[PDB]
Design a protein around this ligand. Structure first.
Ligand code: G5P
Ligand code: G5P
Ligand code: G5P
Ligand code: G5P
Ligand code: G5P
Ligand code: G5P
Lengths: 201, 199, 199, 201, 199, 201
């Protein structure tokens, strides 16, 4: 069958990464996966290539754009990020649900090419709290806070909203959406094709 | 703020009503409730008028039909069942999500009057298990299975499908569908209004 | 071995009583129970004397006051409510934890007679949601909201605060408070006495 | 706001480490953290510096004591261990709940400087069982068993007691204490400051 | 397809019956049920004939014994209790798992007639806690403790042992035993028949 | 006491590995462990020796067989795999429940030497699904599918059956079997020896 494509977006400091990482730890590669994006930003201490991202240089990323290799690409917080079309179409083909961690610009592009992709937006519990999480120079902090408020402007465009106040709760909300989507008729009629045959035949 | 209307259907013995009661005992009345349908069938030991059903006579049921008192109504195995429009509109306007335990016939009439409603169909894990649950004479049991096969055929008309093999597993699937529907933008926009404005 | 006394309070519509009943259905009588208060208010359909309340007449309630039969008592919206001292002392001496669903007035009188008691206050997630839950004429609803705002003002007098936005989330918070109180040294010292001596 | 300071103590072989590690795996760095202590003992296979501990040499640890750099320090099982005051005060300041894994000597020192710190003691289910866990030379085993019995002598000084018989259960007990503490009025009045305003205004 | 018969026993105050009711409220009738025993003891307030027990007179109980109506029967503290063979065989043939809340005496008679049955014995966490739960005059309480110590002595005759210290913990242990028994090859072979053939 | 010996078998692509790995992450080394088997196959990227397996060369494995060092050994998918008898008997002795991940050939050998070992078989939800998981050349895929169908032929020999459709569910089934086994009288009479004494004395 075909897996469902998920778009997950959020301002930095909403917990989106840890939520997605905690999610994957409970799902087998044959059911759920996160997509491997291409980026120009430097790998982070303890972040292997090809796994988290495909780290390429500014020129290398620019030649992929010409090659129309991207399903979408955008400039985010000083670097280029894009979704290799090959991987996404192949993984979805084997029936796997693929998670695309992307900013709102990328989300618009995908909604335009894959109308059935589902989008989830994640909001922090409050401004103060969003601020406390960001801090973890006041000039760089204000820069992240400005980008974070802009990103949140586009929340109403997504199908789902998870307010990540209490971590565990938001992690369950994220699991709950995945499961409810696999309970939809279209996917269930396929997964239980046999049984349905037996019951009506 | 209007609540969502859920349509749940299944052939007898799929475990439908015992899945709903387990769900409801986990939710307060201001969040979720189940509609109390009208019926001409005899009350079973334990059933109380107004609670499980509004048991009426064939004549009375007719009276209500003629006066458009039903959001939907239909005959299910030699008896009538209907959802009084009034009760539903009143509970929906208070923001409560309503569960409608009705057959595939009523489900259709509800889909038209409320295209926003979400419908869930429940299936037994096999025809043998179905048979077992149905048995609770070989003749009466074969006629029950006949009405079930007819119910199960309209399954594709529903948004969600739960194969209730393992009770808890299926109960968590129902709980999951309602939880996910509440995480939808339109619903969330409202209940989190002015948190998004503060942000 | 004496049990802990829990004070739970909230304005009407915060979901207080439906949070307690969900808790109690998860605990045996030798562990947790709820006190059955006395009241002069009319029994609501379903309520049974001795179970939910001990429904008495204004005269009778007065008699008990004059004879110091109440650990605490107060007038809540044109009616009297009180906790008979006797029932409580008897159940507390058997090691059972007791839940007191009472208003901010009774809570105070209980804090003095039992400084060891733990009090939990429950809040609705917003004034709109509060209003919605309260609506269950614009006049009667405004007077209900007025008595709620007055209840919510004494919230800081409580040890714990639960914002009951999502029912299950709030139910697990209550369950969590009672579980954590049982992990306290004084309580644990006793119930694990002679395990610590073996160690 | 200010996060709550936790003291967790236990005789070796009670499971205290694995409980604390399992705990952190479910909490974001912005809510819960374990403090990084200084020690003279050797790092263990697969234990990075600055993360688990700050591994220093005997002389280096001795000069920090003069510098009054420690909130507390003690000698435990042949080595020096201490809590750098800087980190603790800074992390707590950003509202984070910090866990201090320390012996009973350290616990006394902290209770004296931070009267609002909360302490949790963890006991094994029985002596035999404590013994089975220790074993994992009978001369070294008896030495750990003697130190372990001494440590347990000080249990009555802690606010909470978790009997770690069934792991999962003790892990839930440990999560349950953290959550119940964040439900206290003082911390809730701050976290929900806004809402309370709206409801009473 | 025949269901499994579970034997659950314990001394008064171990929390046995409140552990079973919590279990049953989590399972549908086509999966699990509890047998309604016969007894000569007086119905306690709330108990209903046919639901909790089949309350009969000493004469009537005798009549049934003489006519081999009991799969097992025994005297428990000055009264008779028995499991009507008929009800059990009927519910077992429908594939339902049956719970038998009976004493160590009945358990033995059941082990012989159904060697396939699984028996679970429940213990209090200590004699003090046992005493506390039992207290609900020092004389009547000492005689209760005497009958409990005698019950607890036949504990080794059971397949499983649950030390009900923490209610939820013990409830999950019961739930776990039934879930594991259902994962056994013989049971699974059947309910997953023709999935193994497709594979 | 003595821990219980578990045998877990399944055709490749049933999820058996990830289930067992997810299991261990929630159990302390003093309660549950997976046995370290000897094998001739190459270690996999990110798989340390002595931990997952004891990787030896074809000749080295052949000399262990002569030394009767194995409780069982078998040829599986092109390589030799065996269970060192030493480790198993020692770990079980300290009361630990040891998990043996082995094929059906090995399972028969163990059932013959350790009649009280408990065996769990894990089946995929369907043939198609088993196929989807395998794929992750059509000549090598058909080879795994043939071996996988053979392996499944021996399912009826095991005490338990877990159908790993929904991962989380199968993970709970696997936890549920372990716990129910520790609730058996024999093991409980030992674990609660003291209490029982007090209650009947
Ligand atoms: N179009 C497009 N866009 C793409 C693509 N790939 C990625 N993007 C976009 O690029 C951005 C991702 O950039 P990144 O550099 O990969 O960042 P990230 O790992 O996703 O995490 P962040 O942006 O920093 O925020 P986030 O808070 O979600 O992370 P988390 O790790 O949970 O953070 C934990 C939190 O805890 C705090 N914390 C840590 N320690 C703390 C302490 N002691 N006290 C208080 N708080 C503390 C931290 O400060 C942080 O807020 C996203 O906007 C994404 O959508 C693509 O292919 N296409
Ligand atoms: N259009 C419309 N339609 C409406 C409306 N209201 C109702 N309807 C339709 O009318 C029908 C309802 O008729 P009903 O007589 O009220 O039946 P019900 O209460 O819904 O229960 P069942 O038909 O038996 O099914 P169900 O499996 O869901 O019950 P459950 O509680 O799980 O049962 C437990 C199971 O366990 C078995 N069981 C019981 N005891 C057993 C034992 N000892 N051993 C083994 N199994 C045992 C039982 O046989 C049962 O299957 C449905 O098709 C419904 O959709 C309305 O307003 N409009
Ligand atoms: N000093 C003292 N004080 C005492 C003592 N005993 C009691 N009191 C005080 O007296 C008051 C209790 O009065 P009561 O008449 O007994 O009320 P109650 O049973 O406690 O229920 P409520 O006031 O309505 O609040 P609550 O929200 O907690 O109920 P809940 O069950 O969640 O309700 C469900 C919710 O859902 C709504 N709902 C219901 N149907 C709905 C529908 N169709 N759609 C939408 N919403 C719907 C309802 O309106 C309700 O809010 C409390 O303030 C208490 O503290 C005592 O001994 N001493
Ligand atoms: N004042 C002060 N004090 C400080 C400070 N920092 C640390 N300390 C103190 O120093 C001590 C910590 O020393 P450490 O060297 O860091 O030890 P640790 O990692 O904390 O673990 P242990 O002491 O060995 O015991 P624990 O049983 O709790 O660990 P765990 O990993 O769960 O163990 C798993 C268990 O399973 C067993 N196991 C393993 N395999 C087994 C097998 N096959 N069979 C049976 N059992 C098996 C193991 O043997 C072990 O018991 C503590 O007393 C701490 O309070 C500080 O800053 N200030
Ligand atoms: N052979 C055979 N035998 C059969 C058969 N049927 C029954 N029997 C045997 O007959 C006996 C049953 O007698 P019964 O009179 O029916 O008793 P029961 O309903 O089974 O309840 P108990 O004896 O009191 O024990 P249990 O602790 O299990 O109840 P629980 O509901 O947890 O109770 C809650 C606990 O909390 C305490 N409690 C209550 N209120 C309290 C308060 N305020 N404070 C503190 N504690 C309080 C209570 O005292 C109780 O311990 C059992 O030994 C059973 O095995 C049969 O067919 N055949
Ligand atoms: N006698 C004896 N026998 C022994 C001994 N030791 C081991 N054996 C036997 O040797 C075999 C083990 O060989 P191994 O090389 O160690 O393999 P393994 O790690 O156990 O995993 P596999 O055999 O490949 O299957 P499995 O599906 O169970 O793994 P998992 O990692 O869950 O797989 C994840 C799944 O997801 C799929 N996947 C991954 N990515 C996917 C994607 N994008 N889309 C769809 N599916 C995707 C993968 O393809 C895989 O099916 C077993 O048959 C075992 O019983 C011993 O001492 N004695």
């Amino acid at each position: 069958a075909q897996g469902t494509l998920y778009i997950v977006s959020a301002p930095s400091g909403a917990g989106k990464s840890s939520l997605i990482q905690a999610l994957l730890k409970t799902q087998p590669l044959y059911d759920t996966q996160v997509s491997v994006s291409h980026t120009t930003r430097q790998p982070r201490p303890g972040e292997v290539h090809g796994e988290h991202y495909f780290f390429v240089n500014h020129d290398e990323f620019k030649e992929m754009i010409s090659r129309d290799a991207f399903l979408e690409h955008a400039e985010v917080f000083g670097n280029y990020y894009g979704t290799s079309r090959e991987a996404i179409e192949q993984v979805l083909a084997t029936g796997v649900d693929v998670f695309l961690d992307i900013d709102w610009q990328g989300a618009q592009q995908i909604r335009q090419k894959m109308p059935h992709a589902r989008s989830i937006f994640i909001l922090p519990p409050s401004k103060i709290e969003l601020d406390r999480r960001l801090r973890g120079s006041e000039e760089v902090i204000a820069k992240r806070m400005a980008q974070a408020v802009a990103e949140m402007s586009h929340y109403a465009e997504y199908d789902y909203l998870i307010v990540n106040d209490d971590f565990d709760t938001a992690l369950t909300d994220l699991k709950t959406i995945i499961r409810a989507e696999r309970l939809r008729m279209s996917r269930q009629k396929q997964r239980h094709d046999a049984l349905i045959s037996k019951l009506l035949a």
